[PDB]
Design a protein around this ligand. Structure first.
Ligand code: B12
Ligand SMILES: CC(C)(C)C(=O)SCCNC(=O)CCNC(=O)[C@H](O)C(C)(C)COP(=O)(O)OP(=O)(O)OC[C@H]1O[C@@H](n2cnc3c(N)ncnc32)[C@H](O)[C@@H]1OP(=O)(O)O
Ligand SMILES: CC(C)(C)C(=O)SCCNC(=O)CCNC(=O)[C@H](O)C(C)(C)COP(=O)(O)OP(=O)(O)OC[C@H]1O[C@@H](n2cnc3c(N)ncnc32)[C@H](O)[C@@H]1OP(=O)(O)O
Ligand SMILES: Nc1nc2c(ncn2[C@@H]2O[C@H](COP(=O)(O)OP(=O)(O)O)[C@@H](O)[C@H]2O)c(=O)[nH]1
Ligand SMILES: C[C@H]1O[C@@H](n2cnc3c(N)ncnc32)[C@H](O)[C@@H]1O
Ligand SMILES: [Mg+2]
Ligand SMILES: [Mg+2]
Lengths: 157, 1063, 233
């Protein structure tokens, strides 16, 4: 419950922070230069947590990742490429992981904290990034140890 | 290299069968392997297929039979072939799971070469079957050819057909050839040549001209037809597609042979003079030759014929082009066909003047030149008759005895067919609709940006005042965007908080419950609203996907789903009217709302009465209920109050739809007349009956399919000509408007049939919406208020495994709502698209039939999730038979389990919000719009059908799918992967009883005897209704009381024409 | 840590999820009080749930993952491998009946679907049959997973649940319902303290009876059992 309370508060901050800077850019587009807005904005940069600020910061980079046809990620000294697209008979590109199209940074952060993509905290949509390709365990148990063993050897041949 | 010999095939679908999807992909593999294929199309009797194969002298016959009655059908064919010198012709068949293993062994034992099961297709492969099929027919037929002309001259048409195969292959003796030409010279019979540009209408016009000859001379003329089509030299074989257009050649005095050019260039067979000479010696009264698509500087037909007829369309570019056309310099007659097209009048004046110039007849009027304006697509076209009258006078002078004609010897050169379905001004209607939708979305983006900024400003304004520093400079920019926002958009955001309070409580104030509580004690809201803070997202959502029951009705056209009346509506039909009436009571048992769905047998689907001939008899009562008279229709719905508000009947019928509808209406009326006679113990007076009859028409609830645009494209149940069916379909809607029939749906604009033919979800949705909009444009140009026919429009779709199917319904609703509002300016009732979804039958297979329930469950789920209006569920024995009593319950249980047991289903908009759903919705929508644009640049739906665009695209996608199903790239569990280590018994089938067949026959003859006096009189009145161009359906309301289905259909044939197949 | 038996005994999805997570956390507290480090036994902890027809089952997995991840991070300060709750889902056997056994494949399909949608780690599918697990009956069950994973179109997306207004609202509701149940067990002396009174047993028994009641009541429709029954038997 404490975690969710934080999500609400940090969202309100992230939302307001965006709303201010948004209004600041619109005033400068009309001519009026009121830095009074910027003061309230920079005030909420500190109000936002360290973790939350990095979440919104990585959001555009996150979008570019799940946008392409592949997912490039370098582990150790090499890399692990993964396909994001499966194409239908109609020729429609079905993305493995579909990202939201929110404009409000309040909703973006709220979503990133409550239901991040599969493979990211709090792992709501799954503990792994993408599902494994290709697992069916072989259950057997009856009679004495000899019969159960033979069934094991037969199935697992 | 292809086959060793010139291998020819005759391909067709069985009698009263529309399933061409199978046979079409076979003639494609046949042609590619180097075989000449004489494709006859769908709905072919034995007497048709056999006569064709005998005149073409083929080695093989390929037939598809999916309607059942295949055992009787193939037996008849085998018998008829042997009887008439065709024993050496091999017959191949296929019908998927319909033809059970036992019947295959039986038929193959009877004489049939091979019948392929779905299991054969998997093991052998698509190409494997055709390879096996082609290698069997790889035989030289020149050994059966006559050595002397004795047989041919005598009048033997089979000997003639074989002599031609000898002459064409050049295996005929030189002394025999010269002897043939010698007698052909002394024969002195006229030879008419018909040439012209590709697809102009050479075949269609040829057929019509022959029909004129038959009607005028009482079938006293013996006509020989030699049609030539171009041959693809790459494969080796060709697609001789001229015979398929011929409907008037079915007569002993008519003979037709299809030749391939067998050269990549020449528009005439290398042995054409030999073939013509052979017909002349066979004592024919007239020989007609159709060439292939020739260029402007092509005229190879001229030296081989006695008279030449150049056929062209009004579209030839500039008027200067006519000076480049060599054929205009030799042609004795010029037929400007497709005179219904734009610019036909001006086209005639250019061609006429050009012919006058080429003949240097300056002392003659341009209008007196042998240039005719014809419309072969139009039944009994006066233009064609004018051309015919001209050809007769010319053939008369060239030594051809003919009796004084019985046809209207009219004057003029131009057709007066002033009928138009869609005016050329509205030709690009589909493109306009695409723009309308895209324009709507552009507005959503802009208005959102405004609403967002407006909020952002006032938000910052309140935050500044909370710190002290007040700046009214922000407020100025905010108030600036209050005006920027539209009137409608501003009210949407204004009602949003009030909207939230509505769907928040336990009830919706009439009061409706919003909450269903689980066993865990969790409150599941019927409609779940978003929790967005950004007013940009709120407005964006309110405009693109509002709650169910609000524009654009993306999540449904109604606020909440019906309380008692579930969307369930199970298709039913087997045997006679009595047995189906039992099945209705079986399906609708335990349900306060009786939602029936009627299936008709192949015989009724094609407007025919049941008969003793094995062609028809074996199909009676199979694949659906056999309905032939009004008395049958009454029995069918006995015990069902059709005028009851909680009772709706869905009849699936297309070609004879107006006739069947009249029977249903008469049934519903007679029910209330009987109900009155019982509640008052007396017949109603003339005034009382009039009040009852009128009331029935208004409150009767049900749906008739009747979508003819999809018949040409998909289902092929069109019996009359396409134009005539559309004419009568309009008559129905006009009748409905006059009598305020506001609860019955005049047409179920479908795409299921299009989909099952092979079309992917995008094609299905796009074509269907296109067809729907076509009817709209047709009715609008016909003089009906948009709010008068739009609420009567019903839709029908398919749900398969493809991802797009999950959002098919919601896309269809939005595209409709937006266009109906912005483009056509219709009211709310019109913007609401109601549709029926039936699970994909082609997605179910014969192998491992238990797996089909899994697929049918998943398909049924996304249908209900997407808030469909009506749902049908397929049985597990879908590939093999009509649902058994036990089989229909498993299908019916799928809906019952989801609707009652399934937890997620307790929410009515579970799709909404999903990132996948919204993205898919946007993608599919745009894909549909792009397809609209493709159809629009082909002249609209009608213009595209003229080229066979839809049929071409469907058949292509069907092939692409099928190439992959057998391949393995597209996994199908239990078919191409995860097979059974066993390979598997005898399943129960739904065939019709012998007693039931004899019952229908005896009922028919009894009905006929009852109204024997008024029969001829009523039918005559019906034809006069077409001639005088009155309302056809209005007469049908009386006609079905004294006439049978077949009587009416065949009567209309004499005045409405027959459908011309379109490959 | 299993909860299959708890649900099968009669516990509704909320009780099942709550009791199981409670039992899991009990093992954690038990191992910690032995002086052990959290990152040494938490990645070894596996879970085991049931999927029925109830709406809550659709979001059971995602709720279990979030409650675990948040607590393992904030409360116990464990690493990433520990915050990841991996679980096996087996379709509800109670939900399948002896009457009209062909209907069970329909139910087992729907249950298998939401399991895969919610990105489960392991799935078992129940046969249509009472009788011994015939090699034919096991193939129909095994085909359900094969059809969804390979043929079903929506399944080609790995997070189709995300975004859904219904899913997110249900996720929040179920989560809080679980937390409230934690508090009820906590005021009974923890899981061990509650077992001492037979709280869990009592509550499961209470819910099993309530279900078996509404089933007989005709209030809770079961196709082929209390409604749409076989006209032959
Ligand atoms: C697609 C389809 C349709 C489409 C037809 C589209 C079209 N233009 O062809 C639509 C939706 C229009 C349709 C309508 C109807 N249909 Co339908 N349809 C089917 C369906 C789903 C598949 C048939 C198909 O085309 N399969 C694709 C082919 C390529 O594959 P296959 O059949 O497995 O064939 C393989 C081999 O056998 C081989 N083979 C097959 N034919 C041939 C031919 C040759 C020459 C060769 C060499 C090989 C060969 O090739 C394939 C290799 O894999 C079947 C059910 C099913 N799944 O079997 C019902 C089915 C055939 N239809 C049926 C019925 C009853 C109808 C209707 C009459 C219903 C009604 N009362 O209105 C209507 C009207 C038809 C009409 N217009 O006259 C019933 C038949 C019942 C019976 N005969 O006992 C079926 C079995 C459905 C059912 N279970 O009730 N139909
Ligand atoms: O069988 P398994 O469960 O033992 O797996 C053996 C490892 O592979 C990882 N793994 C499994 N499925 C995965 C998936 N879809 N995406 C990513 N990683 C996946 C597991 O976390 C295991 O690694 P670790 O020791 O780090 O815990
Ligand atoms: C391939 C093959 C086999 C050859 C085929 O083609 S098989 C084809 C099988 N075809 C079919 O089954 C077609 C079935 N389709 C239909 O029946 C047709 O298209 C259908 C599907 C269109 C007919 O469906 P309906 O259930 O009768 O329903 P309705 O729309 O008529 O409803 C009639 C009024 O009742 C109220 N109402 C209804 N639902 C409501 C709700 N949820 N909330 C509130 N009020 C609701 C409203 O007042 C309605 O009128 P109005 O709005 O003008 O005031
Ligand atoms: N709009 C229109 N279409 C026609 C007319 N006559 C024939 N057609 C169509 O043109 C197409 C091809 O006809 P076809 O006879 O095969 O032409 P051919 O290939 O030159 O012999 C078919 O779709 C016909 O329905 C006509 O008078 N008007
Ligand atoms: C064309 C589609 O129509 C359905 N269909 C065809 N005939 C019947 C019938 N008698 N009963 C029920 N459904 C039928 C099947 O689902 C098939 O796939
Ligand atoms: Mg032609
Ligand atoms: Mg031609």
């Amino acid at each position: 419950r404490a975690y969710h309370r934080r999500v609400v508060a940090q969202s309100k901050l992230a939302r307001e922070r965006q709303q201010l800077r948004a209004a600041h850019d619109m005033l400068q587009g009309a001519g009026h230069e009121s830095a009074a807005l910027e003061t309230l904005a920079s005030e909420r940069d500190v109000s936002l947590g360290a973790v939350e600020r990095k979440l919104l910061a990585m959001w555009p980079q996150m979008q570019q990742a799940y946008s392409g046809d592949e997912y490039v990620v370098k582990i150790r000294d090499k890399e692990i490429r993964t396909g994001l697209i499966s194409t239908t008979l109609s020729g429609t590109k079905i993305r493995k992981v579909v990202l939201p199209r929110f404009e409000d940074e309040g909703e973006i952060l709220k979503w990133l904290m409550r239901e991040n993509v599969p493979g990211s905290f709090p792992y709501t949509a799954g503990v792994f990034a993408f599902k494994r390709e290709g697992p069916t365990r072989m259950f057997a148990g009856e009679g004495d140890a000899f019969r159960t063993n033979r069934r094991f050897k037969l199935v697992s041949e | 290299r292809g086959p060793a010999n010139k291998v020819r095939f005759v391909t067709a679908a069985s009698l009263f069968d529309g399933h061409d999807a199978s046979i079409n992909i076979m003639r494609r593999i046949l042609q590619s392997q180097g075989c000449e294929v004489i494709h006859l199309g769908h709905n072919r009797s034995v007497q048709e297929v056999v006569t064709a194969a005998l005149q073409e002298d083929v080695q093989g016959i390929a037939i598809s039979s999916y309607q059942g009655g295949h055992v009787e059908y193939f037996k008849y064919m085998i018998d008829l072939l042997r009887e008439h010198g065709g024993e050496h012709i091999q017959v191949f068949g296929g019908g998927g799971g319909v033809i059970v293993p036992d019947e295959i062994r039986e038929l193959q034992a009877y004489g049939v070469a091979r019948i392929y099961s779905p299991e054969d297709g998997q093991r052998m492969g698509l190409a494997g079957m055709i390879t096996d099929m082609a290698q069997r027919c790889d035989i030289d037929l020149t050994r059966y050819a006559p050595t002397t002309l004795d047989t041919v001259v005598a009048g033997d048409r089979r000997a003639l057909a074989q002599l031609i195969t000898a002459l064409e292959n050049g295996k005929a003796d030189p002394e025999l050839v010269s002897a043939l030409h010698a007698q052909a010279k002394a024969a002195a019979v006229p030879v008419l040549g018909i040439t012209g540009t590709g697809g102009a209408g050479k075949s269609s016009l040829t057929d019509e001209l022959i029909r004129r000859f038959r009607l005028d001379q009482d079938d006293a003329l013996s006509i020989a037809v030699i049609s030539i089509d171009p041959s693809r030299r790459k494969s080796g074989g060709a697609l001789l597609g001229d015979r398929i257009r011929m409907n008037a050649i079915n007569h002993p005095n008519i003979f037709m042979r299809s030749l391939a050019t067998r050269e990549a260039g020449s528009e005439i067979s290398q042995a054409l003079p030999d073939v013509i000479a052979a017909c002349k010696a066979a004592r024919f009264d007239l020989v007609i030759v159709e060439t292939s698509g020739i260029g402007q500087g092509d005229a190879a037909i001229v030296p081989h014929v006695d008279l030449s007829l150049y056929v062209m369309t009004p579209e030839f570019g500039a008027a200067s082009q006519l000076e480049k056309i060599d054929m205009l310099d030799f042609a004795d007659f010029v037929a400007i066909n497709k005179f219904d097209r734009k610019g036909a009048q001006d086209a005639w004046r250019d061609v006429a003047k050009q012919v006058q110039r080429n003949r240097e007849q300056w002392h003659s009027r341009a209008e007196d030149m042998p240039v005719y304006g014809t419309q072969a697509s139009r039944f009994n076209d006066d233009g064609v008759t004018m051309l015919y009258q001209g050809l007769v006078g010319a053939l008369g002078a060239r030594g051809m005895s003919l009796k004084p004609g019985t046809l209207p010897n009219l004057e003029g050169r131009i057709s007066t067919g002033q009928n138009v379905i869609v005016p050329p001004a509205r030709s690009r209607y589909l493109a306009e609709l695409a723009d309308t939708v895209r324009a709507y979305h552009r507005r959503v983006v802009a208005q959102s940006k405004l609403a967002r900024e407006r909020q952002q400003l006032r938000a910052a304004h309140d935050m500044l005042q909370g710190a002290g520093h007040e700046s009214a400079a922000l407020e100025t920019l905010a108030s600036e965007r209050d005006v920027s926002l539209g009137a409608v958009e501003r009210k949407l955001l204004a009602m949003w908080p009030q909207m939230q309070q509505a769907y928040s409580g336990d009830e919706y104030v009439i009061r409706t419950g919003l909450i269903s509580t689980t066993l865990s004690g969790t409150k599941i809201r019927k409609v779940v609203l978003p929790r967005f803070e950004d007013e940009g997202e709120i407005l964006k959502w309110l405009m693109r996907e509002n709650v169910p029951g609000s524009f654009p009705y993306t999540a449904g056209v109604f606020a909440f789903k019906r309380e008692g009346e579930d969307p369930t509506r199970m298709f039913a039909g087997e045997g006679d009217a009595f047995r189906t009436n039992r099945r209705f009571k079986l399906v609708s048992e335990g349900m306060e709302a009786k939602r029936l769905s009627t299936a008709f047998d192949s015989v009724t689907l094609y407007g025919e009465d049941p008969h003793e001939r094995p062609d028809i008899y074996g199909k009676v009562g199979n694949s659906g209920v056999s309905i032939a008279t009004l008395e049958d229709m009454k029995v069918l719905y006995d015990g069902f109050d059709l005028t009851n508000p909680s009772t709706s009947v869905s009849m699936t019928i297309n070609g004879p739809a107006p006739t069947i509808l009249a029977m249903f209406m008469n049934t519903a009326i007679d029910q209330q007349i009987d109900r009155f006679r019982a509640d008052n113990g007396r017949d109603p007076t003339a005034d009382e009956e009039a009040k009852i009859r009128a009331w029935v028409l208004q409150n009767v609830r049900g749906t008739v399919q009747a979508d003819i645009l999809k018949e040409d494209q998909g289902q092929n149940t069109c019996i009359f000509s396409t134009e005539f069916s559309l004419k009568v379909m309009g008559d129905i809607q006009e009748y409905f408007v006059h009598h305020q029939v506001r609860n019955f749906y005049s047409v179920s604009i479908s795409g299921y049939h299009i989909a099952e033919a092979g079309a992917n979800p995008i094609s299905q949705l796009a074509f269907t919406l296109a067809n729907g909009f076509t009817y709209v444009e047709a009715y609008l140009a016909r003089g009906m208020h948009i709010d008068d026919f739009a609420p009567n429009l019903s839709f029908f779709f398919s749900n398969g495994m493809d991802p797009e199917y999950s959002v098919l319904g919601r896309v269809a609703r939005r595209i409709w709502a937006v266009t109906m509002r912005d483009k056509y300016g219709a009211n709310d009732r019109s913007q609401k698209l109601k549709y029926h979804i039936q699970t994909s039958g082609r997605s179910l297979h014969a192998q491992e039939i238990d797996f089909n329930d899994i697929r049918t469950t998943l398909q049924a789920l996304i249908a209900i999730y997407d808030n469909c209006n009506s749902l049908h569920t397929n049985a597990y024995d879908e590939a093999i038979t009509t649902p058994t009593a036990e089989s229909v319950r498993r299908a019916l249980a799928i809906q019952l389990i989801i609707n009652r047991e399934w937890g997620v289903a307790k929410c009515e908009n579970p799709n909404q919000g999903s990132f996948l759903i919204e993205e898919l919705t946007d993608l599919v929508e745009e894909a549909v719009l792009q397809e609209f644009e493709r159809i629009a640049e082909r002249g609209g739906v009608l213009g595209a059908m003229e080229t066979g665009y839809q049929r071409g695209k469907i058949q292509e996608e069907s092939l692409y799918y099928e190439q992959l199903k057998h391949d393995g790239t597209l996994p199908i569990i239990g078919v191409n992967t995860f097979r059974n280590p066993n390979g598997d018994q005898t399943l129960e089938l739904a065939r019709s009883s012998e007693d039931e067949k004899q019952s229908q026959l005896h009922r028919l003859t009894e009905f006929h005897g009852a109204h024997q006096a008024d029969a001829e009189a009523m039918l005559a009145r019906l034809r006069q209704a077409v001639i005088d161009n009155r309302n056809v359906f209005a007469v049908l309301m009386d006609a079905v009381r004294v006439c049978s289905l077949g009587q009416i259909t065949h009567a209309l044939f004499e005045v409405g024409g027959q459908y011309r197949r379109n490959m």
